[PDB]
Amino acid sequence: MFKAVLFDLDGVITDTAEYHFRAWKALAEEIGINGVDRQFNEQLKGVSREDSLQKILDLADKKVSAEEFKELAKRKNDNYVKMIQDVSPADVYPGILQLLKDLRSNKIKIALASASKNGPFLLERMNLTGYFDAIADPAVAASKPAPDIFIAAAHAVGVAPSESIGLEDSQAGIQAIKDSGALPIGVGRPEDLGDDIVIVPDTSHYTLEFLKEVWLQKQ
Ligand SMILES: O=P(O)(O)O[C@H]1O[C@H](CO)[C@H](O)[C@H](O)[C@H]1O
Ligand SMILES: [Mg+2]
């Protein structure tokens, strides 16, 4: 009965949240900020580029000019873009490709609900572009935890958020799905994502049949 699945990209479709963390940590360290560790990174996962830089600057109460802000965000993006040039279809997380094929087979809409402006490039690297019905443009969207990206993804495929399931690996993204009206299914540790939603240990658990059951049970 759900008519759409709204996929986050980084950390759900492939291991790209890890490279974003590495590049942000590298950027932070260059400007003398050392607090970007894996614990702090849980607050940055799924957050847009500019909002992530601001969260990093805030950690140390540092202020930069509008021109230095743009230079810093660009430097980090340049590093990250270099890091992902070799991303291949072998990097698609287990179960994701089969889920995309089964959702297609059952006429269920597929949308990307990513904050990443590098999303289209990554889907191309992974030969996944053709499995997506729409990509919610991040460029008309407020950063997660705001529900904006998930609301935009659902409507990009002509479905209401209430008729959709959202898949996420981050604290900000889970909250975004929750406020969108869509049903969240997290992937990761219960210590990071919480105990109130349905959570799976790895993406191999994201099957069409599991998604149908979670949906049957929300009722
Ligand atoms: O727009 P990007 O720089 O490609 O991606 C932006 O959003 C993604 C969402 O996973 C990450 O939070 C990344 O650190 C951030 O910079
Ligand atoms: Mg993510």
CA–CA gap between residue 161 and residue 21 (Å, rounded): 29
Do 172 and 185 meet the contact criterion of CB atoms below 8 Å apart? no
- Phi first, then psi, for residue 115 (nearest 5°) are -85, -15
PDB experimental method: X-ray
CA–CA gap between residue 128 and residue 38 (Å, rounded): 29
Which among 16, 20, 85 is the best mutation to test ligand 1's pocket, defined by most ligand atoms within 8 Å of the CB? 20
| Exposure letters 118-134 (e unless 16+ CB within 10 A, then b) | bbbebbebbebeebbbb
Of the candidates 23, 10, 149, 20, the one whose C-alpha atom is nearest the C-alpha of residue 92 is: 10
Contacts of 213 (CB under 8 A, 6+ apart): none
Rg (C-alpha) for the chain, rounded Å, is 17
Long-range Cβ contact pairs of 60-66 (< 8 A, separation 24 or more):
60/32, 60/33, 60/35, 62/31, 62/32, 62/33
Which of 10, 15, 179, 192 is the catalytic position?
Answer: 10
Q: Report how far apart, in Å, the C-alpha atoms of 32 and of each of 23, 57, 71, 76, 155 are.
A: 14, 10, 16, 15, 42
Counting ligands in written order, the one closest to the CA of 203 is: 2
Resolution in A: 1.9
Domains detected in the chain: 1-14+93-219 (3.40.50.1000), 15-92 (1.10.150.240)
**8 counts as catalytic:** yes
Quote the ligand 1 centre to 116 CA distance (angstroms): 4
Residues paired with residue 185 on neighbouring β-strands, in sequence order = 167, 198
- Phi first, then psi, for residue 181 (nearest 5°) are 105, -10
Q: How many residues are there in the chain?
A: 219
Residue 182, helix vs strand vs coil: coil
Q: Where are the beta strands (DSSP E) in the chain?
A: 4-7, 109-112, 134-135, 164-168, 183-187, 198-200
Which among 18, 24, 41, 52 is the best mutation to test ligand 1's pocket, defined by most ligand atoms within 8 Å of the CB? 52
Greatest Cα-to-Cα distance within the chain, rounded to the nearest angstrom: 52
Long-range Cβ contact pairs of 208-216 (< 8 A, separation 24 or more):
208/99, 208/102, 208/103, 208/106, 208/108, 211/2, 211/5, 211/99, 211/165, 211/185, 212/2, 214/165, 214/183, 214/185, 215/1, 215/2, 215/165, 215/183, 216/1
